[PDB]
């Protein structure tokens, strides 16, 4: 088993215990790279109500390497948590935060009623209610242009068939669970044929040559015999392929 000899941990906690979460219409994105990602901490936690992985299993995350991890975060209403998934429709899935159908990542959510609700109502959390068309996966739209519902141009003015596109969640401590705020973190795992920069907490072993071994090179796995090569890899090339286009 061979992984880059890095020891710094990934700033996941910095995403999860942030004082302020974004509105879903204007969700935040943090790029995570060049670090060790321990996902057992997040998964084995008793604090999350939702922890759903798509594309990967939650118990194999620590054996994987990714080129990049994105951590998207926002607050939504409890009933809308089901919309943060592949293949969903609804006001959040369509106008605020869209996940691709081939999404690889984990959706993590927890009830944050004790942080985000106010007695008179917390009106700082917004969602897009109207949009001319659905969002593309991972698209943001933070405009406040008046939505034209009819055939008559609005010219920036609200009125009959002219709507302000955003609306607030009136988050109150007395709301039922489906109306309580949830903090959502979506971890998107990018996999392209490039150096991996985010790897789980795997220990490396000594390199063994001229013997049949089970190997794992920065996420590349297989069985074979490792020998010294006479191939001239260019400084940027990480692996090679045969005529058959196999490693």
């Amino acid at each position: 088993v061979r992984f880059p000899n890095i020891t710094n941990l990934c700033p996941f906690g910095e995403v999860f215990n942030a004082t302020r979460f974004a509105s879903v219409y204007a969700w935040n994105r943090k790029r995570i790279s060049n670090c060790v990602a321990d996902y057992s901490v997040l998964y084995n936690s008793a604090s999350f109500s939702t922890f759903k992985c798509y594309g990967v299993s939650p118990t194999k995350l620590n054996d994987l390497c990714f080129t990049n991890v994105y951590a998207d975060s926002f607050v939504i209403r409890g009933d809308e948590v089901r919309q943060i998934a592949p293949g969903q429709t609804g006001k959040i899935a369509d106008y605020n935060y869209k996940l691709p159908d081939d999404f690889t990542g984990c959706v993590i959510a927890w009830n944050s009623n004790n942080l985000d609700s106010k007695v008179g109502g917390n009106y700082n959390y917004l969602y897009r209610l109207f949009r001319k068309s659905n969002l593309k996966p991972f698209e943001r739209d933070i405009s406040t242009e008046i939505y034209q519902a009819g055939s008559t141009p609005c010219n920036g003015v609200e009125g009959f068939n002219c709507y302000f596109p955003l609306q607030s969640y009136g988050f109150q401590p007395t709301n039922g669970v489906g109306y309580q705020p949830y903090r959502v973190v979506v971890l998107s795992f990018e996999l392209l044929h490039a150096p991996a920069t985010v790897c789980g907490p795997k220990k490396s072993t000594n390199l063994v040559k001229n013997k049949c071994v089970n190997f794992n090179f920065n996420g590349l796995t297989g069985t074979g015999v490792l020998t010294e090569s006479n191939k001239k890899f260019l400084p940027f090339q990480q692996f090679g392929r045969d005529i058959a286009d196999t490693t």
Partner: antibody
Framework: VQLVQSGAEVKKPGASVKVSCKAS????????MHWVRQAPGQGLEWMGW????????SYAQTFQGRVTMTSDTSITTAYMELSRLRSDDTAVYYC??????????????????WGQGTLVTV | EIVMMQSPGTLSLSPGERATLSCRAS???????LAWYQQKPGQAPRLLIY???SRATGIPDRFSGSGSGTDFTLTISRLEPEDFAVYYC?????????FGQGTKV
């Protein structure tokens, strides 16, 4: 659902008056706040509205350029500010709740909740 | 603009009897945009009927409405002391809310 208005005011002609309306029991930004005036012995007159989510407004032509409507969602309160007052403005001012124009059913066509009126004398 | 006219200006009847109030309009009104309010002396108006015929929440089944076009009515099947108040018709159209002059019961 409650709408609670400020107490009575007495102003000189040419002055300005501000009448607050505090909302509770509902999502403040989900509704429009309208104001309706009732001069003594008269019927009801619509003045205009404020949409708290965007602070969007519309005014009746009668008060257009005379009244400014504002709101503050942090305290779920609507304000009417009527300037350049005249004796003909002596009236009871009511705040009223109605649905936004996007309501599928015409909830914007009527006022389902009213505050207690505030008497303003000029 | 549109003139909203109610009739009679004053209705006179006894508790226990039936009352009908009418609202006429210069121009045709979608039934969905016609509403009725009750104002007791010293109190804010409260919604009775909306959409011409639908009762507002908390309103007794004694109150009903009907109408279309230019002609709408409010009927009280049986009156109680609380019904001897001023009733208004209200309509939405264009971009404005128009009230009738009110009829006293």
């Amino acid at each position: 659902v409650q709408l609670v208005q400020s107490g009575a005011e007495v102003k000189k002609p040419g002055a300005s008056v501000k009448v607050s309306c505090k909302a509770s029991g509902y999502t403040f930004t989900g509704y429009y706040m309208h104001w309706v005036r009732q001069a003594p012995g008269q019927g009801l007159e619509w003045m205009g509205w404020i949409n708290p989510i965007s602070s969007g407004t519309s005014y009746a032509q009668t008060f257009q350029g005379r009244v400014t409507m504002t709101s503050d969602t942090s305290i779920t309160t609507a304000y009417m500010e009527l300037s350049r007052l005249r004796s003909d403005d002596t009236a009871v001012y009511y705040c009223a709740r109605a649905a936004p124009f996007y309501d599928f059913w015409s909830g914007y066509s009527y006022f389902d909740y009213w505050g207690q009126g505030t008497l303003v004398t000029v | 603009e549109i003139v909203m006219m109610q009739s009679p200006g004053t209705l006179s009847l006894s508790p226990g009897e039936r009352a009908t109030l009418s609202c006429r309009a210069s121009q045709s009104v979608s039934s969905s945009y016609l509403a009725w309010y009750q104002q007791k002396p010293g109190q804010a108006p409260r919604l009775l009927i909306y959409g011409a015929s639908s009762r507002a929440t908390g309103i007794p089944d004694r109150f009903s409405g009907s109408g279309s076009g230019t002609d709408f009515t409010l009927t009280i099947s049986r009156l109680e002391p609380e019904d001897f108040a001023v009733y208004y018709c209200q309509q939405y159209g264009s971009s404005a809310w128009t009230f009738g002059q009110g009829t006293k019961v």
